[PDB]
């Protein structure tokens, strides 16, 4: 409730908690190239002749799919160059001191990164020997997409960067996180403990240095509890984990559509053109072949258009991921809700199957209490001499200083106050005076 | 008794022979072909996707797939002229054959943390100025099409 007086009511938390917000950004899509001649004509010359009358549809499809795949490669290269840090501190066991970073430590992917991939259901690409594996072991799964790709003739290309290189980029970023967020600019890197960096970030949010020193162990324990919850975080309820699964599902749906469309008759007597040749005389069979060609042409053009739209969306999302890495992972973010909910403290990045997984540690206020407060204090004897609290509030208890983030009464000092011009709202004290005003 | 076994896609995935021995049916599988070409060399390298070279200098087995007539560079280059996927890149010899060059992860300067109150700081003693060029497309050419003229070529019967 607002007070009709110079004094104003302030609600300030007497308790603090650490929570991790999990976010998934999709920076890449599976790259797919389709063989038009096998898919549309099933290797039949008569279909190719009819397709030629329509135009060089097959040549256009191959070039368009290559262009989207090259665009995806360009986007991945740009994103990884942005994430890389010029100067980094080598990762060591027990990194972060009292704070436990073993989950984020490379085991090389980190334990959280490995766990996320295991939790998500992904069909094995088998790039080295997939063609042999499909024939020897049969379909890996019922309606296996990888085996279906070979029969159709469409192929899923491998990503621009291998998993080990991507893991190296995230590992270097984790080492540089403590050093980069100590001063403005990337020109100078300071090698400092992770715990020291966290305390400086907490001082920035407004917790007083004296409170941080008294609660050093308590702060470390709360951060560790939040990371432990993050380890058990992946679940059906978690939205970010579901988004990772949805991205894998979207790639799977596109592959499934090509195989299903081949089966569709499209008004033809038989799905197989060869079966049509046996079933009907050649002029009648040609009309059935044309119906299959028209449906396959529509599907191939639609699939290329779908890949183009998905590639455009991934490229825009990749730019957002680059902005997030610089804004939250490489520096504490003043902006609210851009990274973690509540006051952002630190962020960590691990690779995801179709993008980057972002985990943001945030400061959450609790047990708020209401205390009377003053905008400023002025000496009764000297009206000109006045002070205003810096990153804090003046609270009756007479007047003490409390950090904005955490409620702790402390003696008013020149360090926590700034001299200001006198205001009518500012209180006049004829009793005990704080030292900045004792002039 | 049915003899013909079909998958959900309706493709014929199984058949029972007259002798009664069941044979799984897999449609003949095409081998994917991709072309790696460099204009300056005017030479190309044939790439097969996800295919063990057993079906294809001789061919080189790589994690991405089988590349015909390819010799491993055995060298690491950060720059990649032609991406082959994974950590691979085709690098023209310049003309000779393209080389298979692994992309090299550039390593950040490493500053060791000190178990002391004093902390190591890496700070530059030299500075340089560089210009970064960016293009943003604020507008597109505006196009208006006369549908009647395009679809009917000015013919009344089409209209």
């Amino acid at each position: 409730d607002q007070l009709n007086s110079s004094y104003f009511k302030l609600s300030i938390p007497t308790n603090f908690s650490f929570g991790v917000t999990q976010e998934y950004i999709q920076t890449t899509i599976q790259k797919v190239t389709v063989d038009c001649k096998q898919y549309v004509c099933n290797g039949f010359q008569k279909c190719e002749q009819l397709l030629r009358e329509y135009g060089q549809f097959c040549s256009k499809i191959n070039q368009a799919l290559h262009g989207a795949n090259l665009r995806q490669d360009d986007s991945v290269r740009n994103l990884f160059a942005s994430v890389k840090s010029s100067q980094s501190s080598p990762i060591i066991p027990g990194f972060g001191g009292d704070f436990n970073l073993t989950l984020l430590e490379p085991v090389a992917r980190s334990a959280i990164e490995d766990l996320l991939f295991d939790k998500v259901t992904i069909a094995d690409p088998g790039y080295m020997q997939g063609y042999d594996d499909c024939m020897q072991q049969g379909p890996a799964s019922a309606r296996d997409l990888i085996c279906a790709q070979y029969v159709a003739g469409y192929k899923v290309l491998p990503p621009l960067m291998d998993v080990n290189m991507e893991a190296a980029y995230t590992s270097s970023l984790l080492g540089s996180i403590a050093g980069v967020g100590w001063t403005a600019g990337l020109s100078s890197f300071a090698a400092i403990p992770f715990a020291q960096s966290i305390f400086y970030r907490l001082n920035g949010v407004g917790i007083t240095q004296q409170v941080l020193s008294e609660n050093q162990k308590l702060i470390a324990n709360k951060f560790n509890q939040a990371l432990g919850a993050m380890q058990t975080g992946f679940t059906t309820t978690n939205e970010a984990f579901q988004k990772v699964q949805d991205a894998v599902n979207n790639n799977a749906q596109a592959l499934s559509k090509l195989a299903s469309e081949l089966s569709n008759t499209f008004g033809a007597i038989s799905a197989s053109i060869g079966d049509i040749i046996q079933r009907l005389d050649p002029p009648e069979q040609d009309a059935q072949i044309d119906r299959l060609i028209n449906g396959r042409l529509t599907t191939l053009n639609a699939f290329v258009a779908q890949q183009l739209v998905r590639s455009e969306s991934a490229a825009l999302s990749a730019q957002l991921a680059k902005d997030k890495v610089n804004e939250c992972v490489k520096a504490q973010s003043k902006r609210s809700g851009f990274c973690g909910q509540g006051t952002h403290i630190v962020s960590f990045v691990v690779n995801a199957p179709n993008g980057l997984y972002f985990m943001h540690v945030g400061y959450y206020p609790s047990n708020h209490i209401e205390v009377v407060s003053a905008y400023g204090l002025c000496d009764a004897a000297n009206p000109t001499n006045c002070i205003a609290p810096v990153n804090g509030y003046f609270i009756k208890t007479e007047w003490s200083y409390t950090g904005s983030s955490f409620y702790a009464p402390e003696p008013i000092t020149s360090l926590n106050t700034k001299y200001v011009a006198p205001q009518v709202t500012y209180q006049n004290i004829s009793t005990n005076l704080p030292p900045p005003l004792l002039g | 008794q049915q003899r013909f076994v079909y998958d959900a896609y309706q493709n014929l995935v199984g058949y029972y022979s007259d002798d009664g021995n069941y044979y799984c049916l897999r449609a003949c599988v095409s081998v994917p072909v991709s072309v790696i070409y460099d204009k300056e060399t005017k030479t190309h390298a044939t790439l097969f996707g996800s295919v063990a070279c057993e079906h294809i200098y001789g061919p080189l087995q790589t994690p991405v797939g089988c590349v015909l007539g390819l010799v491993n560079s055995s060298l690491f280059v950060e720059d990649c002229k032609l991406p082959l996927g994974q950590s691979l890149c085709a690098l023209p010899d310049t003309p000779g054959e393209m080389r298979l060059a692994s992309i090299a992860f550039n390593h950040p300067i490493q500053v060791d943390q000190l178990n002391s109150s004093y902390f190591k700081l890496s700070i530059p003693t030299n500075f340089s100025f560089g210009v970064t060029q960016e293009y943003i497309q604020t507008t597109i050419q505006k196009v208006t099409v006369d549908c009647k003229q395009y679809v009917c070529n000015g013919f009344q019967k089409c209209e």
Partner: protein, 330 residues
């Protein structure tokens, strides 16, 4: 449908370890259907006398697309004989009798159940050891208690368990001879006999008419335990049958040997889209009928029996006109 009751496996092909929607003639989910039960004829002491049965023959039902029959549903269960409430005997599996005619003939007394021209008759014979199928013109005999004859409540085929079903001697044609008294057989096009092993296990019999010919499906021949119907017989009938009348069967059991007989349920077949679950064997144990309810429509739409929790739109119910509307010039 979830118990795969009334389901006929597609003749054209088999599906293994997959779930897909298939369009075929199937019974409605939750359909009680038409139930016909056979009871022992009235008997005094050890001598069987007047036959006792309901007027199934008088009742006439449209053949339509065909019907599926549940056989021995109540078999091997504690039961009381239908004719006598006081008498109780264990229920025994029995075999149904079907008479199918393209057109309905008129009896001399004007009673229903006669079929004009050739009539397709499926008759259990030799106590269910064999099933006899023939397409034959039927002539009512003028004898007393026969359809042409006066004072006949109904025409019922009959057999005696003590003599016809004797382990030493089995009379295969005894049921056929009883049918011959009730209806004379004139110019029968063909005679077909199929042997069915005696069992108390549940069985399914389905009859449908196709351009190639009438098709007979029995679960026992291929998947007796599954209950899936598999075609075992083909009939060369090229005349569409529009009406079928069940033939009541009266069993001439002695008063002491009167036994409960399992009821047989007839379910009409109509084209339906059925989501089908196929096991590694490829036989169907579970299915969903979309027509019965909106939840069934949801399962058919997604094509999954079990779906993640959500609110999903399904086809809206559509109003159907009661009658056509006709106006006039002036």
């Amino acid at each position: 449908v979830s118990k795969a009751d009334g389901i006929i496996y597609p003749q054209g092909r088999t599906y293994s370890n997959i779930t897909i929607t298939y369009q075929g003639l199937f019974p409605y989910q939750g359909d009680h259907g038409d139930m016909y039960v056979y009871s022992a004829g009235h008997a005094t002491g050890t001598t069987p006398q007047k036959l006792f049965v309901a007027n199934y023959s008088q009742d006439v039902k449209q053949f339509a697309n065909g019907f599926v029959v549940r056989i021995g549903a109540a078999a091997n269960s504690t039961g009381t004989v239908i004719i006598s409430p006081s008498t109780s005997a264990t229920i025994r599996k029995i075999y149904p009798a079907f008479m199918l005619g393209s057109s309905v003939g008129n009896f001399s007394d004007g009673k229903m159940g006669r079929f004009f021209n050739h009539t397709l008759v499926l008759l259990p014979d030799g106590c269910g050891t064999l099933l006899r199928a023939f397409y034959c013109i039927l002539e009512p005999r003028s004898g007393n208690h026969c359809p042409a004859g006066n004072s006949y409540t109904s025409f019922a085929t009959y057999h005696t368990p003590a003599t016809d079903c004797s382990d030493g001697n089995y009379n295969r044609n005894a049921s056929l001879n009883s049918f011959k008294e009730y209806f004379n057989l004139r110019n029968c096009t063909f005679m077909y006999t199929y042997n069915i092993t005696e069992d108390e296990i549940l069985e399914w019999f389905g009859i449908t008419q196709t351009a190639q010919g009438v098709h007979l499906f029995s679960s026992r021949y291929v998947d007796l335990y599954g209950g899936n119907m598999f075609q075992f017989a083909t009939l060369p009938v090229y005349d569409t049958i529009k009406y079928y009348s069940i033939i009541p069967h009266s069993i001439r059991s002695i008063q002491s040997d009167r036994k409960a007989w399992a009821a047989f349920y007839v379910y009409k077949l109509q084209p339906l889209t059925f989501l089908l679950d196929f096991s590694v064997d490829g036989y169907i144990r579970r299915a969903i009928d979309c027509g019965f309810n909106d939840l069934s429509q949801l399962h058919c739409s997604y094509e999954s029996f079990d779906v993640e929790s959500g609110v999903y739109s399904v086809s809206s119910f559509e109003a159907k006109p009661s009658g056509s509307v006709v106006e006039q010039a002036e």
